[PDB]
């Protein structure tokens, strides 16, 4: 009979994972589809062949901006040369622990985020369930998912790799105190000054 692709069932995949990614109108890849394993993802390609561009587009899709990843901002690179719009779509598991969502119920297990980049228009516009929304809603959705772009632990880039290469003990203390609540250290320091 007709060949059928594997069902992208979000229930089987762990919450917060991505099953299928659609990349439309990008450098050397006008239409591409990508699948990610639930346990770990391995991508093999030379640098500058668009694999790094694909990863950067995926990062930009989840409320990501090039200047917020500690790297140079090149919006034009993502856009296909001669195509007006470049589209990146990310599908994620949805659980009833995140607020400020559009067209998606709490019981629904799918949160689809689409980023379109065009040269003519300069604004941050994202799509939830193919409905236009401001970047603030996606950014707060990412913040409520306990995933941070600015923090070096969740996302690591070449500049972040260089920063981590020379790391002082004070930086490790700051990271440890920021991962846990930092109020306790401040209270202990105030008590030490009182002593």
């Amino acid at each position: 009979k007709r060949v059928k692709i594997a069902k992208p069932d979000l229930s089987s995949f762990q919450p917060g994972s991505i099953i299928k990614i659609r990349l439309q109108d990008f450098v050397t890849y006008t239409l591409t589809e990508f699948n990610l394993s639930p346990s770990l993802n391995m991508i093999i390609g030379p640098n500058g062949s668009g694999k790094s561009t694909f990863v950067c587009a995926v990062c930009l899709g989840l409320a990501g901006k090039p200047e917020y990843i500690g790297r140079s901002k090149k919006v034009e690179d993502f856009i296909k040369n001669g195509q007006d719009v470049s589209k990146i779509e990310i599908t994620l598991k949805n659980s009833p622990n995140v607020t400020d969502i559009e067209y998606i119920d709490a019981r629904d297990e799918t949160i689809k985020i689409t980023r379109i980049i065009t040269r003519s228009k300069r604004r941050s516009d994202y799509l939830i369930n193919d409905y236009q929304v401001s970047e603030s809603v996606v950014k707060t959705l990412v913040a409520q998912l306990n995933i941070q772009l600015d923090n070096l632990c969740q996302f690591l880039s070449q500049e972040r790799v260089e920063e981590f290469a020379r790391l002082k003990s004070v930086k490790l203390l700051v990271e440890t105190i920021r991962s846990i609540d930092a109020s306790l250290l401040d209270v202990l320091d105030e008590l030490r000054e009182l002593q």
């Binding site: 440890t176 209270v187 202990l188 008590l191 030490r192």
Partner: protein
């Protein structure tokens, strides 16, 4: 100064007790977190030998 001595002597006990209570509340949580991160670091570096 004899009247001033008890007022200062009363202090350094409540302040130390509050510092000891804060240290006693804070210490086990950081200790377990440090023990867990050290155990994860050792188990990850066991592959490195």
């Amino acid at each position: 100064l004899e009247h001033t001595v008890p007022q200062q002597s009363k202090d350094l006990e409540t302040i130390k007790a509050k510092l000891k209570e804060d240290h006693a509340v804070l210490e086990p949580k950081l200790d377990d977190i440090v023990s867990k991160i050290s155990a994860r670091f050792a188990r990850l570096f066991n592959n490195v030998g």
